[PDB]
């Protein structure tokens, strides 16, 4: 479960 976001 991701707790942050990074570029696709």
């Amino acid at each position, epitope marked *: 479960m*991701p*707790i*942050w*976001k*990074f*570029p*696709d």
Partner: antibody
Amino acid sequence: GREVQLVESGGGLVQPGGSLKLSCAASGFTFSNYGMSWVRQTPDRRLELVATINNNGGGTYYPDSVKGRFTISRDNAKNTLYLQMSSLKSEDTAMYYCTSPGLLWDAWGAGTTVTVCS
Amino acid sequence: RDVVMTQTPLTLSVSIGQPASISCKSSQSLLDSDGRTYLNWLLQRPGQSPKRLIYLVSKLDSGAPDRFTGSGSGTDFTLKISRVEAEDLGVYYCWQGTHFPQTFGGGTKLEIK
């Protein structure tokens, strides 16, 4: 708790229009599992993300204030993150932090100071 | 268009033991297509690197004390300190990760009266 650590290096003096490479060594966790980001803090104490990269290195982002001048990259076998800065201006004089917000354990480095000369 | 994070108050002077409340309002909804809201709270103690206290609006960082509570939704977010102690003084920042660029709030300085 477990010991995760990030250590920035390569900060120092640089002339306007010059170039500088920063490195961030990661230890204590599987580096290749996480995206990484460079966050800088200007003398006015404001925080700004200048570069971010996903875990495999194929996806990067830069804000417009910096886009085209900085290049983020990573070497997962070497457990190292890089920030290549070029065409530097006085606005880039700041403390440069290395961080991985995807980690459940708080992971920031102590930072490395960059000073753009007159 | 970049998301602007308007954080208030700029300075908050408190006595030790008193409660505190910090607000962060986004110019754009921070709800992601995957159903999560990426909103972090950080505290930079003097002479220290920033330290995460909350992620995903309300989840308390395992290295942060149980005196911080994160809440909010959409564009309005709030950080509350149940009782301000010496450890809690410093500059707080809200950080949104839903949209690129992932921008910070302007900071909130929590100091002693």
